[PDB]
């Protein structure tokens, strides 16, 4: 990322997540950082593999909710963090949709 190495960055991240290792609360930040790559016009994006990423994300967030409450602190910013998380996954969906659009427009 820091030198913006999109191709091999994404390939490594794909390999790492296919390896299926580490707690969920951090795969949060993982895909949070994966965001702008997903934004960038790239053809190597395999949306279906991105979506086992997201379905595991659903699985993990369900498990996280079952194991604990995301916010045990009541403050003006706890609901901010939550709604931010939903917005994040909404951004995931919308960006994936755009990536699919670009991939198709390039499959011409």
């Amino acid at each position: 990322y820091s030198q913006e190495q999109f191709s091999e960055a994404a390939s490594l991240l794909l390999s790492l997540m296919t390896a299926r290792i580490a707690p969920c609360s951090f795969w949060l930040t993982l895909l949070l950082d994966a965001l702008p790559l997903l934004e960038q016009k790239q053809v190597i994006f395999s949306a279906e593999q991105t979506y086992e990423l997201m379905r595991c994300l659903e699985d993990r967030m369900a498990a996280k909710l079952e194991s604990t409450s995301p916010d045990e602190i009541q403050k003006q910013d706890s609901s901010i963090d939550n709604t931010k998380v939903e917005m994040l996954r909404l951004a995931l969906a919308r960006n994936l949709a755009r990536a699919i659009v670009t991939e198709g427009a390039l499959q011409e």
Partner: protein, 110 residues
Amino acid sequence: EELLKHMYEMCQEMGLIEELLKLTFTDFEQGYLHKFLQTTGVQNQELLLVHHLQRANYISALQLNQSLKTNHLNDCDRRLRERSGARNAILDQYGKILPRVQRTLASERA
């Protein structure tokens, strides 16, 4: 830019707007159009709102609608009030169905 301005003025005079809206364009042309029409009064604001919608520009249409509603808080023309109440109903109808970004903005306090 001189060609663009001349076309805009003359096409405004002789009413070829729908014909013009049916062409291939460029980003610079639309950007200059937006810059020119932004500073040219309220009625041009609703016309360019129509143009946003004609090119399917609903987020920008809603931003322009918010700007117009904020502007119309000291205007007291009754025809403008009628049109603005219609516009408020219009935007309340449209924004809720659009993609979810403006829905989060609506969930946010105002």
